[PDB]
Amino acid sequence: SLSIHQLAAQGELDQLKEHLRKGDNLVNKPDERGFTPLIWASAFGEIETVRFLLEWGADPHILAKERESALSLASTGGYTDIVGLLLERDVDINIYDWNGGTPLLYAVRGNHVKCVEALLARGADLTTEADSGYTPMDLAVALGYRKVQQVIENHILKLFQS
């Protein structure tokens, strides 16, 4: 055999360690689409693999060939724990890609309420619109995701209080 990208994707941490021991500065090596092992592990919710890769030297900021990021793939999957680990490394919480959105628009679209709560708590910008002009709250309202809307409303009211 499996590539370093599949080993990371599949949480095969002991094999991934061996691969990186034998190779020359492979941790940030992009595949055909620009994906790093960290983006693969992120996209699969493989928490201790992400931790290990960050510890080894992985760069969480890297964008793939259509601007896909570790944070937007973790947010898409609702993988709250990965979002935390990546935002401890001050990745761009509002990173925008040509698919048309951002981590918060992706967590909303998937009805991933715990990931929406975490991204808001981390300071994600509620005014950052989709390519279509919709804000995250516009999207929650349009989709009828009532709990997601509630947790957006709860956050908005805290932003204006000291």
Partner: peptide
Amino acid sequence: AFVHMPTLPNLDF
């Protein structure tokens, strides 16, 4: 085992 990268979501509804 061989796994496939998940897509970013479709913002249409």
